[PDB]
Amino acid sequence: STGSATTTPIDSLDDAYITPVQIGTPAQTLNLDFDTGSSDLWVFSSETTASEVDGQTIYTPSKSTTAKLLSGATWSISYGDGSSSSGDVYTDTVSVGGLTVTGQAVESAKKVSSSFTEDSTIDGLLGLAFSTLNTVSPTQQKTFFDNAKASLDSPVFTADLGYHAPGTYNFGFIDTTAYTGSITYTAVSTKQGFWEWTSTGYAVGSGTFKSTSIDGIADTGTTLLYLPATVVSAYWAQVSGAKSSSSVGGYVFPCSATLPSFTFGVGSARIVIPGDYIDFGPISTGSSSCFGGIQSSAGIGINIFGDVALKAAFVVFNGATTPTLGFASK
C-alpha cells in the first residue's frame, strides 16, 4: 500500500504545516501537524476542556462506530517549546492520503496548553518519530507509520515541505519526480527516539564549506533551524545589523536586509537553504526588526534540523530494520 497527502503551511511564514487526516467511521477529517520529532497522535476532541478549544476541529469518538476506548490508558506530553497536552486514548481507523491503519491509537486531549488553544489551524499532532517516545501509559502505543510499515510497498515515508507553498507527505514510496539529482543517505541513531543524524558541515552564503560534524534531529514539527552557537554566530555575522536579542529570544536582523543562504552537508552532498527561507518577519506587527530562522541550540541540548532546513530538501525517512535518512535537492 501507499499514501500521499498534501501538507499546507498554516500561515504566511510557514510556522508549521497541516495535513488532513481521516479519523473514524464515518470519517472525521482533522488537520494535523505531522511531527517527526514526537511519537503521539493526539487530537482536539469532544473531551477537550471547552475553554481550551478556540476554532479547532474536534474528534468526537462517540460518533465513530469504529472507535473503542483503550481502557485505562492515559497520555501526557510536553514539547520543546514548552507547550503540552494530555488526555485519554481511543483506538480507531486512521487514514492519511489513502493509506489506512485500523486500530491506531488516537490520543484524545482533555487538556491542552495555551499555545495549542491559540492556534486555531492545528487540530492535533501526528507523531512520526520512533514509537519508543510514545507517552501512552501503562501500555505504550505505536505511531501511524509503525502500524502501517508492514503493509507499505517500501518501509519509508517522505517529507517534501514547500516554501510559502504546499508540499507532500508520501508513505510507502519514493516519488522520483519530486527531487533533482540523487538522494544521499546518512546513518541514523535511534537511541534518543529521534531521526538523529550527523551533518558533515556547513557554509554561509558563497563562503567556503567548513567540515565539522553536527549531530542533530530531522524534526518536521520544529519551525526553525537550531544549530551550535559557533555556527549561528558565523551565519549572522554576515548580516549587517544582526544581533542576538535576549529580550526577543534569539537573533534578529534588519527587515531591510538580504539574507545569505546557508548550506548544510549530508555526507559529501550539500543542501542549500536560500536566504529568504531564513526570514521569519517582523518580531511584532509593524516592526522593522525581523526574526531569524537560524537560532542557537545552546539552550536546548540538541541541534534541530527543523522546517527551515527540511523544506530545502526532499527528505526520506527510511524505516528499514536499520533506519536511515535520505536528503535530495529539489
Q: Please tell me the distance from the alpha carbon of residue 92 to that of residue 71, in angstroms, as a whole number.
A: 13
Residue 321 neighbours by CB distance under 10 Å: 5
Q: List all residues 6 or more positions away from 271 whose beta carbon is below 8 Å from its beta carbon.
A: 263, 264, 309, 312, 313, 327, 329
8 A C-beta contact, residue 317 and residue 143: no
Q: List all residues 6 or more positions away from 265 whose beta carbon is below 8 Å from its beta carbon.
A: 199, 200, 201, 202, 209, 211
Among 220, 187, 199, 177, residue whose Cα is nearest residue 33: 220
Catalytic residue among 131, 199, 296, 297: 199
DSSP β-ladder status, 99-112 and 41-43 = parallel
Q: Kindly list the distances between the CA atom of residue 283 and the CA atoms of 9, 170, 238, 254, 294, in Å, as whole numbers in the listed order.
A: 19, 34, 20, 10, 14
8 A C-beta contact, residue 173 and residue 156: yes
What ranges in 216-300 are assigned the alpha helix state H? 229-236
Q: Kindly list the distances between the CA atom of residue 175 and the CA atoms of 139, 215, 319, in Å, as whole numbers in the listed order.
A: 36, 27, 16
Sign of CA dihedral 111, 115, 120, 123: negative
Q: Please tell me the distance from the alpha carbon of residue 140 to that of residue 131, in angstroms, as a whole number.
A: 8
CA atoms within 13 A on the CB side of 288: 4
This PDB structure is determined at a resolution in Å of 1.1
Q: How far is CA 232 from the centre of its chain?
A: 21
Say whether 11 sits in a helix, a strand or coil: coil
Among 254, 271, 251, residue whose Cα is nearest residue 262: 271
> Under the phi-then-psi rule, with left for phi > 0, alpha for psi from -120 to 50, and beta for the rest, what region is 124?
left
Q: Which method, experimentally, gave rise to this model?
A: X-ray
Q: Please tell me the distance from the alpha carbon of residue 184 to that of residue 198, in angstroms, as a whole number.
A: 13
Q: Kindly list the distances between the CA atom of residue 15 and the CA atoms of 106, 279, 301, in Å, as whole numbers in the listed order.
A: 24, 11, 22
* 51 among known catalytic residues: no
Q: Kindly list the distances between the CA atom of residue 243 and the CA atoms of 251, 260, 297, in Å, as whole numbers in the listed order.
A: 5, 15, 16
Domains of the chain listed by start with CATH number:
5-174 (2.40.70.10), 175-330 (2.40.70.10)
Say whether 305 sits in a helix, a strand or coil: strand
Q: How far is CA 80 from the centre of its chain?
A: 12
Q: Please tell me the distance from the alpha carbon of residue 61 to that of residue 304, in angstroms, as a whole number.
A: 35
Q: Kindly list the distances between the CA atom of residue 188 and the CA atoms of 107, 191, 223, 325, in Å, as whole numbers in the listed order.
A: 28, 9, 21, 7
8 A C-beta contact, residue 284 and residue 319: no
Residue in the structure block whose three cell numbers are 559529501: 268
Q: Which amino acid appears at position 148 of this protein?
A: A
C-alpha cell at 120: 486555531
* 199 among known catalytic residues: yes
Query: What is the length of the chain?
Result: 330
Catalytic residue among 14, 35, 40, 119: 35
DSSP at 221: T
Q: Please tell me the distance from the alpha carbon of residue 199 to that of residue 265, in angstroms, as a whole number.
A: 5
Q: Please tell me the distance from the alpha carbon of residue 114 to that of residue 51, in angstroms, as a whole number.
A: 10
Q: Which amino acid appears at position 263 of this protein?
A: T
